[PDB]
Amino acid sequence: RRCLRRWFHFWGAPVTIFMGNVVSYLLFLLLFSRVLLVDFQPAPP
Amino acid sequence: EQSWIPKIFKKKTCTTFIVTLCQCGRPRTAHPAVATVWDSDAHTTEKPTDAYGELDFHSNFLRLSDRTDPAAVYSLVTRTWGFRAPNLVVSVLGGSGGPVLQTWLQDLLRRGLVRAAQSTGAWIVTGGLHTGIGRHVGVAVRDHQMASTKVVAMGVAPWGVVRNRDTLINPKGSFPARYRWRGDPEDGVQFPLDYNYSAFFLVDDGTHGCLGGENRFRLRLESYISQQKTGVGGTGIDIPVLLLLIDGDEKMLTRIENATQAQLPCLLVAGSGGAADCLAETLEDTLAPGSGGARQGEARDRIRRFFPKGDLEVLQAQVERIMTRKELLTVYSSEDGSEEFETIVLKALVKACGYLDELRLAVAWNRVDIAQSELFRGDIQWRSFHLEASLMDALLNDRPEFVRLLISHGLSLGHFLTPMRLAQLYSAAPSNSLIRNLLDQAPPDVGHVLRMLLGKMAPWSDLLLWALLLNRAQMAMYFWEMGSNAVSSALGACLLLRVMARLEPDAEEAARRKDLAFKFEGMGVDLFGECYRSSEVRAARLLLRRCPLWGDATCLQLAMQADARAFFAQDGVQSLLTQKWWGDMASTTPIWALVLAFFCPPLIYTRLITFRRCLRRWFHFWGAPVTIFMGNVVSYLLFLLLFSRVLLVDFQPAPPGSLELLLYFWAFTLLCEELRQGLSGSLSQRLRLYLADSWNQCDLVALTCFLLGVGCRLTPGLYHLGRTVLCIDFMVFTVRLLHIFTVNKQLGPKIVIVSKMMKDVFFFLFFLGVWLVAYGVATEGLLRPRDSDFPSILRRVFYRPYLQIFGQIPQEDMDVALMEHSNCSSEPGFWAHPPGAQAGTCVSQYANWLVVLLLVIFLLVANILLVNLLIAMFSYTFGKVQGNSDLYWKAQRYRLIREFHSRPALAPPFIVISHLRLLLRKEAERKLLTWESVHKENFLLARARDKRESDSERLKRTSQKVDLALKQLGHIREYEQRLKVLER
Amino acid sequence: VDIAQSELFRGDIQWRSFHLEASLMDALLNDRPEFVRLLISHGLSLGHFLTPMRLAQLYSAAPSNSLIRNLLDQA
Amino acid sequence: LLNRAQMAMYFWEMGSNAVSSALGACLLLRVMARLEPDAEEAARRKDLAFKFEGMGVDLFGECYRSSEVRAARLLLRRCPL
Amino acid sequence: ARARDKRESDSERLKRTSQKVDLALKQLGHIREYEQRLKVLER
């Protein structure tokens, strides 16, 4: 399918993989910060 | 590439056979089962060829039948095989009995023939075999090529004589080919192909070996090639084809007779041997007396040629037929080995033709020296049409050396250039070219093309325009030197080349146009510099004058639109711009003097400012761009002061007072002035250009927030939001003071450099942002404050670490040793109470030595390492971009000065009056051109003299002179030795 | 090289295929870049010249304790 | 392999693959330079490698400016030799 | 192009001029010997 080929072309490009990883890493740091500052407690995780 | 070759070219097989051994040469047993006197047409059948391909010893080869149309062959060589069209074809005949030739003969081939063929880009068509004259030509080509530090030679050989025919046979095609020319057996039945030749034509006649089967095809090919025209279609002359004969035999006299019947010049080498000197002596007889001359030919045939066929009258009859067309025959005068081949060829060609002209032949080849000698011949008189026809050939074929020489020999360009002549020149656009496509979209109709490119903005001017469009760099160079307008033409050429460079589909071509544009821009700089230093006043009149030929626009307009930064960077242009900046007042007027006159209008009539007469002086002062700039600067500062007073004091929730209404009216006139600039600077296209500029974007933002803020303050519930927008709005308005002061020479370059520094700032922010997140979160996580409110967390993570860079370190908020210990929190651990309000109610004491350590590391990395790194990057960037930024501002200076010239003289607070007024609504020139032209010739002469006196040119001239000494010395040695032997 | 150039340029003298082949090895083994260029330009077929026996001799020219020689010995 | 700089120069000019050969020659010379016991010889191999790398730069630059598309196909193509 | 640039370089032209001058000197020396011998023989 031409639509499927275009879909894989966009998400298979190195730049979009780089952008996807950068966005994911920033979200990971935000989750890490939220857990450390607030969600961390002596209670079980 | 190989698909159509078997389709059009037909190989020939024996088919029916007549005899064991057939008369066709094939074995009688080795024949098809279907198989008086053997006939090539009757006894053979035609099948698609199976030997086409490229040889590797790369050289091309092909198998073709004798009865083949030469037109298909010529198209294959010129287009498919990539060989260039020949400017000359030398058909080197020759029997050359014995593997070794006379020393002068081999000298003539290597020094006279091959050198001439390489110089004129000619073709050499001999038998493509390692025997006879073919080997001697091949070694001559190889010997010259090695010593030259490539000649194109074609070989026409009969199939059935080539050694190792089988390895070449491949019906699909053999693009790589393996051949063996070092075969151990040595027999005269078959010969190998010569490795020096570039292309081969294995003519097939269904024979397993014979000589002379390719003569019919070879003669047809030479005759057809002589019918083609040299270069750019039919404009050029017919391709000259001549036959060179060395020695020979009885069969070769038949070849000469056939060539003359085909109207082909023949060049006979005197003293070569039999079948060549026989015709040379016959030509030497010329108008021999009738008595005692008839028997001379018969005796000469027996004397020169071999005894067989001498008694037979066919030889004498054939020679008699040869002399019937003796106008085509010339004899190579030995002249003790003249080796001056090209001149003898020219004499042979012009004599044979009896239209073709000697000058056209020189233009057809790339030999300027031949044309120089022909033109310098005082005895020969040249007609006007002789120069006119030759000049077109140089112009169409892009020969800059010839057109310069032809013009210098008293050629009237005015009568030469005609609309029919001009149409042919523009028809020379090569295939898919930018000019060709524009002409197709657009009689040449060139005027329509120029208007679309430039946008509405003398034979020499037309030729310069033609050369620029076709990207003939050297031709455009020559035409500019002979033009009347030069400074405007140089800038106009730059605009045309640069705008067409943006439209170039090929990146390689666009580089050439940009390269040529840089040359034209430089010469406009050098020429104006020479003109300026002689007379500043006359040079100024040159720039502001309107050149009617280009667009009736000044040179400054052309330079500004062509982005000629180098043209604006010279002192002459900058000094003129400063003079236009000050208007009628002198450029040396002190700034403080201008300020005093501005505040005191009566002072302008006194003598402190140097320039109805009183009314004219009044309008001169207030109409000058500098006073308009000063009036706008003073008005803008007053606007900011009024804006500040309204914001800080006069702003109230009550309906607007008198001062606020004045501010609204003041801002309204500012919007009108900004709108007026955008309108006059294609409504849709103008709006796109206006929004593109970054400075216009901030201006649009500034007025947008003002409209939003004013609306909010009038709404009863949005008073607080109204002030907040205006407070930010004042920031945008104050920033615009930088844009206003871009014109000033002291602050202009510096403001432009600041923009180039933004890349370094963004890197510092990214590095600082990463470090702030890492340190801020870790410190907050270790402290674990009990407030933990989201705004409070953000402040302690980003705001507090940020302020520590600038010396605000709250030790009492992060150090346990400073705060007091308390049991505030019920959660297990040890806690201390910070004294700060936003530091949190309590913080953990568990590992505060790490919190202190992190602060030490943070201060080192941020306050020292990061800040000092940015200083290093700022210093490096400032040094790099200093030169380019200065050039950019200098180019931009003219646009800013011109903009202030069109602005109303009234201040923005009073500009509503001017806006309302805007609504409801020679012999000296020729002398200036002559003065410009005189400086151009002096500038060009100095450039030529410097090149001639350059060390490289003296070395070149000494080398050539030494060559002439060597030729003279060698002649002396030969002459002295011969004379000494003769006198002994 | 000039002597070889004059000898090769002599049109009267005819050179056999093995005459060029034997000479070309001598230039190759003795590291004479000027000669091999000249010999190749005079219609020498490199395809027939290079043989595994011919190739073996070329690699045998590694000078005494050389890096290639030690690697060949280990191989 | 025998570090004949001028001979390796001539053979590269007559070869079919040139851009790949120039880079391949650089890899071979540099890797064998690391294995050289003599420091003087290792310098000569590194010197010859720099010459081959430059010509690969000059040759590709000439190829690129004529046709970017064809030059691109040259780099990503696999050289079997 | 590389070969042509080297050939047209100033150093190469100087080298070629030097060799050509040498060939002139050899030719000139032969002329002097030949002219003197012929003049003596013809006298």
Residue numbers in the entry:
A (entry chain B): 766 to 810
B (entry chain A): 7 to 25, 33 to 48, 59 to 80, 87 to 178, 182 to 386, 393 to 480, 500 to 514, 557 to 710, ...
C (entry chain B): 406 to 480
D (entry chain B): 568 to 648
E (entry chain B): 1135 to 1177
Reproduce passages from the article.
Here we demonstrate temperature-dependent changes in the structure and function of TRPM4, a temperature-sensitive Ca2+-activated ion channel. TRPM4 is widely expressed in various tissues and has important roles such as cellular depolarization, cardiac rhythm generation and immune response. TRPM4 and its closest homologue TRPM5 are monovalent cation-selective channels; they are activated by intracellular Ca2+ with a weak voltage dependence; and their activities are regulated by small molecules and lipids. Like many TRP channels, they exhibit pronounced temperature sensitivity, with activities strongly intensifying near physiological temperatures.
We determined human TRPM4 structures at physiological temperature in different functional states, including the apo state (EDTA–TRPM4), an agonist-bound state (Ca2+–TRPM4warm), an agonist- and positive-modulator-bound state (Ca2+/DVT–TRPM4warm) and an agonist- and inhibitor-bound state (Ca2+/ATP–TRPM4warm), at resolutions of 3.1–3.2 Å. We also determined the TRPM4 structure in the presence of Ca2+ at 18 °C, as well as in the presence of EDTA at 37 °C, both of which yielded exclusively the cold conformation, indicating that neither Ca2+ nor temperature alone shifts the cold-to-warm equilibrium. Given that all of the cold conformations in this study resembled previously published TRPM4 structures, our structural analysis and discussion will mainly address the warm conformation and its ligand-binding sites.
